C-alpha cells in the first residue's frame, strides 16, 4: 500500500508545480516589474497655475503656454473687467499633436497634448474683437500649467 502513497505524493507534486510561497514571490516581483515599467526617469513637472496678461501691441511678443503630454490643460480668457470673453473661432497648427474640447459658446479651452516635443501655434478670433490673438504652445517643460487665465486689456 505504500506504493499508493508514492503515487499520491507525486500526484500532488504534478498537480501543483507551483508552491504558495512561489505564488507570493512571483506576485511580488511581477508587481515590482510593472511598477518599474510605469516608473519614468527624470523629475515630474510641478503642477502650476498662471494668471497672465495678453498684450496686443503690434510690436510686442506673443505669450507662451507650457504643456505636458496627455494631461489636459485649461485656458480661460477674461477681459479687463474680469468677465470671460467668448470665442468666435480658433485654429490650431498641427492638429495631430493637440485636441481641443470646446463647446460652442463658452470660452474654456481644454487642450491635451499628444506629442512630447512637437510645438505649435494658435490663432483665435473673439466676439467683440477684430485683431486676432496668436499664442504659442510648447510641450515638455519642468512645470505643467493646469490652468492659464488670460487678462486682456480689451
Amino acid at each position: 500500500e505504500v506504493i499508493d502513497k508514492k503515487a499520491f505524493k507525486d500526484m500532488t507534486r504534478n498537480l501543483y508545480p507551483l508552491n504558495p510561497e512561489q505564488v507570493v514571490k512571483l506576485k511580488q516581483i511581477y508587481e515590482t516589474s510593472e511598477y518599474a515599467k510605469a516608473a519614468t526617469p527624470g523629475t515630474p513637472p510641478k503642477p502650476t497655475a498662471t494668471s497672465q496678461f495678453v498684450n496686443l501691441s503690434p510690436g510686442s511678443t506673443p505669450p507662451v503656454i507650457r504643456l505636458s503630454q496627455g494631461f489636459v490643460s485649461s485656458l480661460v480668457f477674461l477681459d479687463s473687467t474680469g468677465a470671460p470673453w467668448p470665442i468666435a473661432a480658433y485654429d490650431l497648427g498641427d492638429p495631430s499633436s493637440f485636441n481641443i474640447q470646446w463647446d460652442k459658446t463658452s470660452n474654456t479651452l481644454m487642450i491635451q497634448a499628444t506629442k512630447l516635443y512637437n510645438y505649435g501655434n494658435l490663432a483665435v478670433r473673439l466676439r467683440g474683437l477684430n485683431t486676432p490673438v496668436m499664442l504659442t504652445l510648447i510641450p515638455g517643460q519642468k512645470a505643467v500649467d493646469y490652468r492659464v487665465d488670460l487678462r486682456v486689456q480689451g
Partner: protein
C-alpha cells in the same frame, strides 16, 4: 537690476520672465542688459552661460 526666471527652454531659443512681468525670447548670441552677453544656452539641465559667468535657472518655488 531685473531678475529673470527660465520660462521656456528649447535648443536655440530661450524664454525669460522678468521681475515686473516682462517676457522675452532670445537667441544664442545677444547682449543681455545687466548680465552681459548670452554666452551658451544649454537645453539640458536648464543652464544658461553668461559673460559675467551667471547661470540663469528655473525658480526654486517653480520647479
Amino acid at each position: 537690476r531685473i531678475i529673470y526666471y527660465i520660462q521656456a527652454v528649447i535648443p536655440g531659443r530661450a524664454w525669460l520672465i522678468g521681475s515686473n512681468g516682462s517676457t522675452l525670447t532670445v537667441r544664442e548670441g545677444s547682449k543681455i542688459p545687466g548680465y552681459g552677453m548670452v554666452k551658451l544656452i544649454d537645453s539640458l539641465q536648464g543652464r544658461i552661460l553668461t559673460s559675467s559667468g551667471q547661470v540663469i535657472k528655473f525658480s526654486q518655488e517653480d520647479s
